[PDB]
Amino acid sequence: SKVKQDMPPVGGYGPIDYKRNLPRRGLSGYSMFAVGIGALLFGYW
Amino acid sequence: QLITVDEKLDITTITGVPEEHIKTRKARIFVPARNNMQ
Amino acid sequence: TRPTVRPRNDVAHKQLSAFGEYVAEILPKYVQQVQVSCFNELEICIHPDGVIPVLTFLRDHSNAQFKSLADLTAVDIPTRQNRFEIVYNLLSLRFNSRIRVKTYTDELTPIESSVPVYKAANWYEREIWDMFGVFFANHPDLRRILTDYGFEGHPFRKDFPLSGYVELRYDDEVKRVVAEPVELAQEFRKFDLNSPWEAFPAYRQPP
Amino acid sequence: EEMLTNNRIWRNRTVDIGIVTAEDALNYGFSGVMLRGSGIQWDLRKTQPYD
Amino acid sequence: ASATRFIQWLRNWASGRDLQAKLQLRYQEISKRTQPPPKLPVGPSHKLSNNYYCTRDGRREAMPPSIVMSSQKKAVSPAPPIKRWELSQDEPYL
Amino acid sequence: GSDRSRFLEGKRAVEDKNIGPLVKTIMTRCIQCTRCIRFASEIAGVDDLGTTGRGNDMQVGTYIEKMFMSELSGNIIDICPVGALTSKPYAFTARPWETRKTESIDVMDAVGSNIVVSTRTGEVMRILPRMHEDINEEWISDKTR
Amino acid sequence: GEYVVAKLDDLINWARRSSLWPMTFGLACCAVEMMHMAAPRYDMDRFGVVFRASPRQSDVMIVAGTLTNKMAPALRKVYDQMPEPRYVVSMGSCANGGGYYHYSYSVVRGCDRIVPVDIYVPGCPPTAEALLYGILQLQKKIKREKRLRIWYRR
Amino acid sequence: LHHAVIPHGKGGRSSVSGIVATVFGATGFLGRYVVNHLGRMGSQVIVPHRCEPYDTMHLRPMGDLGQIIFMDWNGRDKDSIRRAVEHSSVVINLVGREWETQNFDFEDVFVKIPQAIAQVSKEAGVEKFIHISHLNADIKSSSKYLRSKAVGEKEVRETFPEATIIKPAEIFGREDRFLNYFANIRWFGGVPLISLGKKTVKQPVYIVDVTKGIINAIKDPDARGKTFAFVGPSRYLLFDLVQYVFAVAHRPFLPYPLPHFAYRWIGRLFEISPFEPWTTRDKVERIHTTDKILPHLPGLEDLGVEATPLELKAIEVLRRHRTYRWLSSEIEDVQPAKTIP
Amino acid sequence: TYKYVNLREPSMDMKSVTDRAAQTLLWTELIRGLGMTLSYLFREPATINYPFEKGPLSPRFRGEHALRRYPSGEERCIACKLCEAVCPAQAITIEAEPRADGSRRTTRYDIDMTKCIYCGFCQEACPVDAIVEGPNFEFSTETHEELLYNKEKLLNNGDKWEAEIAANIQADYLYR
Amino acid sequence: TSVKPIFSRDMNEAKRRVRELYRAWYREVPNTVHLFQLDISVKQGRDKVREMFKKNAHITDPRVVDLLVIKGKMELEETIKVWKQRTHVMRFFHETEAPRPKDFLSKFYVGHDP
Amino acid sequence: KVSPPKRAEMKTSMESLIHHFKLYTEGYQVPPGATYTAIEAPKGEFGVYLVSDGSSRPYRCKIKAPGFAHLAGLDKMSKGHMLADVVAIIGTQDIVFGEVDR
Amino acid sequence: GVRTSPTGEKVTHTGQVYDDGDYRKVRFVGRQKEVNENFAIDLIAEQPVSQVGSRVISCDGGGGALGHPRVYINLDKETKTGTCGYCGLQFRQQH
Amino acid sequence: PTVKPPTARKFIWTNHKFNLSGTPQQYVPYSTTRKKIQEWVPPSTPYK
Amino acid sequence: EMVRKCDPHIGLLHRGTEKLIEYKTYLQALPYFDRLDYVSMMCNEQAYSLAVEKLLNIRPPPRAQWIRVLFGEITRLLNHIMAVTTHALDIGAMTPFFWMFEE
Ligand SMILES: CCCCCCCCCCCCCCCCCC(=O)OC[C@H](COP(=O)([O-])OCC[N+](C)(C)C)OC(=O)CCCCCCCCCCCCCCCCC
Ligand SMILES: CCCCCCCCCCCCCCCCCC(=O)OC[C@H](COP(=O)(O)OCCN)OC(=O)CCCCCCCCCCCCCCCCC
Ligand SMILES: NC(=O)C1=CN([C@@H]2O[C@H](COP(=O)(O)OP(=O)(O)OC[C@H]3O[C@@H](n4cnc5c(N)ncnc54)[C@H](OP(=O)(O)O)[C@@H]3O)[C@@H](O)[C@H]2O)C=CC1
Ligand code: SF4
Ligand code: SF4
Ligand code: SF4
Ligand code: SF4
Ligand code: SF4
Ligand SMILES: [K+]
Ligand SMILES: [Zn+2]
């Protein structure tokens, strides 16, 4: 019988990620600061 | 500069061996006999 | 290229042989032997007086640059008049090369501390003193490092027994750990494994 | 990394802590990341490969 | 894998990733615990001829060290200087 | 030798022979070196051992049912290079690597044969000859053994 | 009489075995499998088992690794500094009986020369699950204590 | 000798001493030292115990593997006594309480239980029997504890004629109820004493002396059928002893006399604890009993033991009773108590 | 090749500068870290329900030792002592003699389980598959002496676990 | 017979190092008993120091003496800095050793060791 | 003569049984010599200086642990730091005392 | 077959039993003496002797690679049976 | 085992026992070898 | 809390591994290398195997060399998880230890 042992699939394995992925999120600094001051002014009023 | 030491080498006091296993032991120096089976 | 035999690399063997005689030419005061092994490792065997000059030359010389002390150890060979072989394994990052430097000493003779050449040597020499009893002169802080406080003897000597001379237990009467002569419930079993038939003719010793 | 890399508390506890110069690492016998952290380009898998 | 769509959405938004594609709990994508028998190959020395051990004996080709000098022209270095490493093109700056 | 086999046939099997209570014979292990035959004839001065048949079926033995009961009989165990001849009293009790060898002297007679006392874990396991050219060479009597 | 102390043992025993706090104390290899028992797959904390660094706030000592002669006085010290009741789990061959360094000049041939041991967990190292089996075996030992029943009959 | 009880080794933990001992009452103060000394030399020790197994854990590290064997037993169940003694070559009886419980009184622990052990040990063919009595055992004693010791000492003598009987004075040690007892009176201010402790004389003996004496009796062929008095080297007035206890502990000593009748009232008030009493009326009687002088009995010296002075070992016991300010005072800082020559 | 883990000069445009001022003052990167542990709070935990659920093992697992038999019930061990010679821990002790029928069999077979390193060398060395390490890992004891196995204990282990031992050997012997 | 010295070039130089060590050990005992809370007396500890010095009084190699002084100094440093524990300090007194009789008859009874 | 044979071969072939027997009792003899061999272990350069006397047991085996030299530099690296920083410096060296102490 | 000595202690298949007066049997008091009651000497004697036709037969113990090393057994002696030195099975030449 | 039962052998335990440590059924070790040295037994009659 | 001097006292886990190895065969000594850096077991095995293979003058087959590199890098992942997460745990960040010890 033919030799059978643990081997990769004939085509090989699919791609494997490894590079760092830290996605960008959030609003600009201007928008965040603007929301905060808008909150304060309504609070004072 | 080398010094002249004029006594037989004795290291018994700096080997850490207990006194019992220096004075009471008998060491045999020999060439082992051939194992007769081979 | 036979599958089961380690391949031989002759370019490195020639390169190491050339540098070996280069070291011997420059330091004839101290170098006693130079050899290269069949797996391409160069060893310099020197007089113990040349520990600092030889190591300093190998660390600093532009054609050496052995900046890293890989390892510093000792071997006990009781049959020799100087039983202790001291072994420095050095690494050269610049020339991607390794060299071994060997010297010798006995029970009562000190060796110059190489700490001034490699600060890595500080603890290696403490280990050699602790396990073999080889004293290093002008060592910044020489004292036991691996054995228990107050431990007597140098365990890595061939004449030190495997199980030592004493053992510990807790004694309830004195409410502390005490040390007593070692007794074993089962003695270690010595095996005589050596075959009475020569294995390697190439290393046969003349009679 | 989302927990440590950009965390200001983590960086405060690690940045400029235990600095070791490249020359000290070599002469002290360091190896591995204790060399590469200081910029020494050295990795035995690259320079003295095995297997 | 049993988490609801709302919870899948919530932990995806909080983490900022698609956690479902790469779950850390293993399900049925793993190998079966009962495998067929192997039939392992043999080595190069499994020949019936032209296979004398003395032609493939590595231990017996080991030799004692070559004595270069024993106390009983251009300058050289231990080896050529190491080449300077090149920066990665995969990702040079993390 | 080589490290593997290319023999793909069935092996010879030989029947065993009783030569007394001291030497057990597993004659399938015999390699027909004829040491035992020569020792018995030359050293022990006893002509009971020999080969019968010829070819692959050549068999070392006595042919008839006979006990090889010399005073020097036990020495054929030592000179037999294989396990074809072994000590019945010693059978199965130890292995060579685990024995401690004590070099001593025999007191069964006034010849002073040099011997090795094999022990293990505080127990005497067997007695072996120790070479001394001027006394017992490399033999010992059966009683000594 | 007998009925009240019988229930009272059940209560003090239940509380003590349901709230077992091992000393944060590991010695060598086996301490790695002790970590894996605290890790998510086995989660010792779910049984009520919580590591606490101080000997004063610990109920169990898990001797996880080789005990050398140099370390032996320190191990006895922190054991003595546990308040009672206290228990010792011997984990791995080294702690159990010296193991693979049994014949070394610098190793204590079993931590039971230094402290009393309640449970011996075999292995080199015992799997994380095997240690968890030992902890649960210690719990069932505590479930059988008869402190008040014996006191009542004194 | 059976081949398995012939001594071997150099006398260490893994050696074989040849002694197979059943120690009754091995979980108490004297028992832990006796078991320790037997295990040290490689003896087989059978420890029949009544307490919870947790309370025997300190005994486990005292012997090599297999050398300490634990069994359950009941002082009234003679089947459980044969099981424990019928493989032994020596039986050691150390059973006793300093108080009477609802279930066992002084007669139980000092007469009925010692007699049962000896009678069962005799039937089992035990060669040797060591029984602990008391120096001050007396039928006419005001202490019922001591009255039972006298009855029990006699009973063990007829039942097992060849028994070694040991009569120690009060024993001092880390876990004693003697030096620790006096040191603990500080919690009440002054130290009450009958007749100001000027009427009682004591000759306390060190725990290790007693233990070595017991162990030497097992091995000494001439200790059979004998009675020994284990006493310390110096006799003290009670007041001098208790004052010395407070000096070594560095605690303020405020003695004041308390009459005999009023100081039984306090003893009766402490007996009400269902736990271990802090003091009892009988404890009061024993502490104020003058230690007997029995020259006709052989002592520790006849068993090869040299008695240890109270001054060498007092600090070993009393250091834990000091405050932080005085924990590190050396042994020399307190002058010895006055002795009775 | 090599790469730089930390050698990036941050941009100095008022938008990037204002972005970092917001990060310093509004704690945005610390809030982001809170998102990660929140996500884990809503993940199924990896904890199994031991002892009702067990961790996965393989047929090669090295557990408690056992001495095996042939189908007839005869012991496989022939006192060759190969296992005793290879044992790195010297945990095996053997004595042998001819049996009453002349068979080569052991009269002592001890394994000090507190010496053993559960390395499996003994079952590699055995030429007859006599000594194996079975699949049992739940045999912790209350005394040291209970872990000093003699031949009777190991033979009982073989009879106890043979059904599983045989099936594991069947699944892995073709890799040996 | 010309060898490299360790410290002292001859016995007279070596003996001065011995006495310097002995003074240091003599002065340190009261602190050791105080610091380690040892139950022994200052006299008992100082007698033990004498006993350890007296067992090496037959040496006449200046190198062997230098190593003994080197090991003595290291031994003292561990005590002063409290690297040793009480168990290590009390190992000099062998308190749990049952005395081993040294006469022929007592040895003859107990075993085969000479 | 170095790696043991397959179990099926050992139970069929005389040469295989002899070599299996000898490899698991005496072991393979190694030609006399000494090597320092190192790898890029996860913690650093891990090497052994291995001495062979020609027999089947190593004569000397010195083990080079990278954590040994890293820890020896702990005092040097901690100069001018606080208690909590030294806790971090111990971690950044990545120390396992099995290799440091051996 | 497992036997009990007059002291009641089971006798092992190696013939071990503490004799009366041996203190070491106290270790079994309140516990038990671990004894395997499947005596291999007895079990192998229950196997039938296998008649074969050839002068030489081989035994690998059964199961191919799961048995023992293959050996060859001579069957020329007609007074006794050929026994396998590994597994104890017996063989006989039929006429 | 419902689908693929284990191979039956007459020596395999028909009754599985759980961990018996800490119970009267616990395993107790002991040496399985017989006495090595046989002592001389003196005669039963007086002659001296 | 400023550190004026660090004096690491080691040997509390010294177990004479190097002396013990001299009493073993080359195979018998291999498991001692698992128990050195007991977080990087298979890498320690590789270092010792290369030294013995070099002294023997033999070569492991190509597949074994690939399995060695494969499990050496799997072993590197085990080490760095232990290194980073226990480093973070000491500094006070305990959670990553749990996520990564499931890996
Ligand atoms: C948030 C608040 C939570 C508070 C939780 C409080 C606990 C609630 C559960 C109580 C259950 C009963 C606990 C009993 C535990 C006793 C400790 C023990 O196990 O010792 C074993 C001892 C047995 O010791 P022994 O007599 O067998 O032997 C001891 C000697 N050696 C060590 C040598 C063995 O138990 C006892 O002595 C008595 C048991 C008493 C049980 C009833 C409690 C009464 C205690 C009153 C004490 C008197 C002072 C008053 C204190 C104030 C009380 C409120
Ligand atoms: C109309 C006119 C209006 C006038 C008024 C206008 C005012 C608006 C603008 C005011 C500024 C807004 C921000 C105020 C909050 C304080 C900001 C702050 O102090 O952040 C800086 C501080 C230090 O950060 P660092 O970068 O290390 O130091 C500077 C480097 N030299 O960073 C830190 O504090 C680090 C904190 C670490 C610990 C954080 C752990 C908790 C984090 C999660 C909590 C999230 C917030 C919860 C709020 C709960 C409210 C109930
Ligand atoms: N000062 C002294 O210490 C002196 C002591 N003695 C005698 O020496 C012996 C031991 O002294 P000590 O060890 O201090 O006494 P302890 O009270 O310290 O220990 C006594 C032992 O007896 C056991 N015991 C007590 N009552 C019973 C009972 N009813 N049933 C079963 N076992 C019981 C206890 O077991 P548990 O722990 O299970 O209760 C304990 O192990 C006693 O006979 C004592 O009278 C003689 C002179 C002075
Ligand atoms: S000595 Fe042995 S091998 Fe040689 S012929 Fe005689 S029986 Fe056969
Ligand atoms: S040990 Fe020698 S004689 Fe015996 S079977 Fe093996 S090769 Fe043949
Ligand atoms: S028992 Fe095994 S895993 Fe545990 S410390 Fe010892 S060698 Fe390491
Ligand atoms: S597993 Fe290893 S250590 Fe344990 S008995 Fe087998 S060979 Fe010895
Ligand atoms: S168990 Fe196997 S290797 Fe060990 S002695 Fe028996 S047959 Fe030989
Ligand atoms: K032979
Ligand atoms: Zn067969």
PDB file of N, CA, C and O in Angstrom, chain C residues 118-147:
ATOM      1  N   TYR C 118      35.771  40.505  30.812  1.00  0.00           N
ATOM      2  CA  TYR C 118      34.343  40.298  30.593  1.00  0.00           C
ATOM      3  C   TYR C 118      33.635  40.364  31.935  1.00  0.00           C
ATOM      4  O   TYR C 118      33.887  39.534  32.811  1.00  0.00           O
ATOM      5  N   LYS C 119      32.742  41.336  32.098  1.00  0.00           N
ATOM      6  CA  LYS C 119      31.949  41.385  33.317  1.00  0.00           C
ATOM      7  C   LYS C 119      31.027  40.182  33.441  1.00  0.00           C
ATOM      8  O   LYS C 119      30.534  39.905  34.538  1.00  0.00           O
ATOM      9  N   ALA C 120      30.787  39.460  32.344  1.00  0.00           N
ATOM     10  CA  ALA C 120      30.007  38.231  32.416  1.00  0.00           C
ATOM     11  C   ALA C 120      30.678  37.198  33.303  1.00  0.00           C
ATOM     12  O   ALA C 120      30.001  36.336  33.871  1.00  0.00           O
ATOM     13  N   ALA C 121      31.999  37.273  33.445  1.00  0.00           N
ATOM     14  CA  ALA C 121      32.750  36.248  34.152  1.00  0.00           C
ATOM     15  C   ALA C 121      32.511  36.260  35.652  1.00  0.00           C
ATOM     16  O   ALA C 121      32.904  35.305  36.324  1.00  0.00           O
ATOM     17  N   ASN C 122      31.882  37.306  36.189  1.00  0.00           N
ATOM     18  CA  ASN C 122      31.749  37.431  37.635  1.00  0.00           C
ATOM     19  C   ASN C 122      31.045  36.217  38.230  1.00  0.00           C
ATOM     20  O   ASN C 122      31.559  35.580  39.155  1.00  0.00           O
ATOM     21  N   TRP C 123      29.870  35.874  37.706  1.00  0.00           N
ATOM     22  CA  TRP C 123      29.120  34.757  38.261  1.00  0.00           C
ATOM     23  C   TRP C 123      29.651  33.415  37.781  1.00  0.00           C
ATOM     24  O   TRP C 123      29.542  32.423  38.504  1.00  0.00           O
ATOM     25  N   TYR C 124      30.220  33.359  36.578  1.00  0.00           N
ATOM     26  CA  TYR C 124      30.799  32.105  36.111  1.00  0.00           C
ATOM     27  C   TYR C 124      31.933  31.664  37.020  1.00  0.00           C
ATOM     28  O   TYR C 124      32.063  30.477  37.332  1.00  0.00           O
ATOM     29  N   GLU C 125      32.766  32.608  37.453  1.00  0.00           N
ATOM     30  CA  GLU C 125      33.882  32.266  38.322  1.00  0.00           C
ATOM     31  C   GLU C 125      33.410  31.917  39.723  1.00  0.00           C
ATOM     32  O   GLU C 125      34.012  31.064  40.381  1.00  0.00           O
ATOM     33  N   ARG C 126      32.341  32.557  40.194  1.00  0.00           N
ATOM     34  CA  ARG C 126      31.734  32.142  41.451  1.00  0.00           C
ATOM     35  C   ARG C 126      31.228  30.708  41.360  1.00  0.00           C
ATOM     36  O   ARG C 126      31.369  29.931  42.309  1.00  0.00           O
ATOM     37  N   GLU C 127      30.633  30.341  40.227  1.00  0.00           N
ATOM     38  CA  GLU C 127      30.168  28.971  40.045  1.00  0.00           C
ATOM     39  C   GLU C 127      31.332  27.988  40.024  1.00  0.00           C
ATOM     40  O   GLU C 127      31.242  26.905  40.608  1.00  0.00           O
ATOM     41  N   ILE C 128      32.428  28.343  39.353  1.00  0.00           N
ATOM     42  CA  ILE C 128      33.586  27.456  39.304  1.00  0.00           C
ATOM     43  C   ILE C 128      34.193  27.294  40.689  1.00  0.00           C
ATOM     44  O   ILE C 128      34.606  26.196  41.073  1.00  0.00           O
ATOM     45  N   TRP C 129      34.283  28.378  41.453  1.00  0.00           N
ATOM     46  CA  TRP C 129      34.760  28.264  42.824  1.00  0.00           C
ATOM     47  C   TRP C 129      33.824  27.401  43.662  1.00  0.00           C
ATOM     48  O   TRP C 129      34.272  26.548  44.432  1.00  0.00           O
ATOM     49  N   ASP C 130      32.518  27.611  43.521  1.00  0.00           N
ATOM     50  CA  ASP C 130      31.546  26.889  44.332  1.00  0.00           C
ATOM     51  C   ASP C 130      31.542  25.397  44.020  1.00  0.00           C
ATOM     52  O   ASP C 130      31.488  24.566  44.932  1.00  0.00           O
ATOM     53  N   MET C 131      31.596  25.035  42.740  1.00  0.00           N
ATOM     54  CA  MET C 131      31.415  23.650  42.335  1.00  0.00           C
ATOM     55  C   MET C 131      32.720  22.883  42.187  1.00  0.00           C
ATOM     56  O   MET C 131      32.702  21.653  42.266  1.00  0.00           O
ATOM     57  N   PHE C 132      33.842  23.567  41.981  1.00  0.00           N
ATOM     58  CA  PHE C 132      35.127  22.906  41.822  1.00  0.00           C
ATOM     59  C   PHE C 132      36.167  23.327  42.841  1.00  0.00           C
ATOM     60  O   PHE C 132      37.129  22.586  43.047  1.00  0.00           O
ATOM     61  N   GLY C 133      35.999  24.473  43.492  1.00  0.00           N
ATOM     62  CA  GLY C 133      36.960  24.931  44.468  1.00  0.00           C
ATOM     63  C   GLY C 133      38.148  25.666  43.898  1.00  0.00           C
ATOM     64  O   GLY C 133      39.121  25.886  44.622  1.00  0.00           O
ATOM     65  N   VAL C 134      38.106  26.051  42.628  1.00  0.00           N
ATOM     66  CA  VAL C 134      39.206  26.788  42.019  1.00  0.00           C
ATOM     67  C   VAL C 134      39.082  28.250  42.422  1.00  0.00           C
ATOM     68  O   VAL C 134      38.087  28.909  42.111  1.00  0.00           O
ATOM     69  N   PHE C 135      40.090  28.756  43.123  1.00  0.00           N
ATOM     70  CA  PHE C 135      40.074  30.131  43.592  1.00  0.00           C
ATOM     71  C   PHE C 135      40.517  31.073  42.482  1.00  0.00           C
ATOM     72  O   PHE C 135      41.470  30.793  41.753  1.00  0.00           O
ATOM     73  N   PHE C 136      39.813  32.193  42.354  1.00  0.00           N
ATOM     74  CA  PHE C 136      40.127  33.219  41.370  1.00  0.00           C
ATOM     75  C   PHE C 136      40.633  34.455  42.099  1.00  0.00           C
ATOM     76  O   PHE C 136      39.939  35.000  42.961  1.00  0.00           O
ATOM     77  N   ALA C 137      41.837  34.893  41.752  1.00  0.00           N
ATOM     78  CA  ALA C 137      42.464  36.010  42.438  1.00  0.00           C
ATOM     79  C   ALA C 137      41.876  37.334  41.974  1.00  0.00           C
ATOM     80  O   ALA C 137      41.521  37.496  40.806  1.00  0.00           O
ATOM     81  N   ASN C 138      41.778  38.281  42.904  1.00  0.00           N
ATOM     82  CA  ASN C 138      41.281  39.627  42.618  1.00  0.00           C
ATOM     83  C   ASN C 138      39.876  39.592  42.028  1.00  0.00           C
ATOM     84  O   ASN C 138      39.529  40.390  41.157  1.00  0.00           O
ATOM     85  N   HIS C 139      39.065  38.665  42.499  1.00  0.00           N
ATOM     86  CA  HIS C 139      37.668  38.618  42.096  1.00  0.00           C
ATOM     87  C   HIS C 139      36.861  39.587  42.953  1.00  0.00           C
ATOM     88  O   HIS C 139      37.034  39.611  44.173  1.00  0.00           O
ATOM     89  N   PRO C 140      35.975  40.393  42.362  1.00  0.00           N
ATOM     90  CA  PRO C 140      35.308  41.431  43.165  1.00  0.00           C
ATOM     91  C   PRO C 140      34.530  40.895  44.357  1.00  0.00           C
ATOM     92  O   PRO C 140      34.537  41.530  45.418  1.00  0.00           O
ATOM     93  N   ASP C 141      33.859  39.745  44.227  1.00  0.00           N
ATOM     94  CA  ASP C 141      33.011  39.235  45.309  1.00  0.00           C
ATOM     95  C   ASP C 141      32.862  37.720  45.151  1.00  0.00           C
ATOM     96  O   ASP C 141      31.823  37.207  44.737  1.00  0.00           O
ATOM     97  N   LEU C 142      33.913  36.994  45.510  1.00  0.00           N
ATOM     98  CA  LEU C 142      33.932  35.547  45.357  1.00  0.00           C
ATOM     99  C   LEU C 142      33.313  34.885  46.581  1.00  0.00           C
ATOM    100  O   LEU C 142      33.677  35.200  47.716  1.00  0.00           O
ATOM    101  N   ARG C 143      32.374  33.976  46.341  1.00  0.00           N
ATOM    102  CA  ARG C 143      31.679  33.239  47.386  1.00  0.00           C
ATOM    103  C   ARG C 143      30.742  32.256  46.705  1.00  0.00           C
ATOM    104  O   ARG C 143      30.464  32.376  45.510  1.00  0.00           O
ATOM    105  N   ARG C 144      30.256  31.286  47.474  1.00  0.00           N
ATOM    106  CA  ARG C 144      29.340  30.299  46.922  1.00  0.00           C
ATOM    107  C   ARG C 144      28.166  30.986  46.241  1.00  0.00           C
ATOM    108  O   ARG C 144      27.766  32.093  46.608  1.00  0.00           O
ATOM    109  N   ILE C 145      27.608  30.311  45.242  1.00  0.00           N
ATOM    110  CA  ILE C 145      26.515  30.872  44.463  1.00  0.00           C
ATOM    111  C   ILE C 145      25.397  29.846  44.319  1.00  0.00           C
ATOM    112  O   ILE C 145      24.217  30.195  44.383  1.00  0.00           O
ATOM    113  N   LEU C 146      25.751  28.576  44.135  1.00  0.00           N
ATOM    114  CA  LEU C 146      24.754  27.537  43.911  1.00  0.00           C
ATOM    115  C   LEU C 146      24.492  26.663  45.127  1.00  0.00           C
ATOM    116  O   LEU C 146      23.358  26.218  45.309  1.00  0.00           O
ATOM    117  N   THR C 147      25.489  26.402  45.962  1.00  0.00           N
ATOM    118  CA  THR C 147      25.283  25.476  47.062  1.00  0.00           C
ATOM    119  C   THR C 147      24.639  26.180  48.254  1.00  0.00           C
ATOM    120  O   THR C 147      24.529  27.404  48.314  1.00  0.00           O
TER     121      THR C 147
END
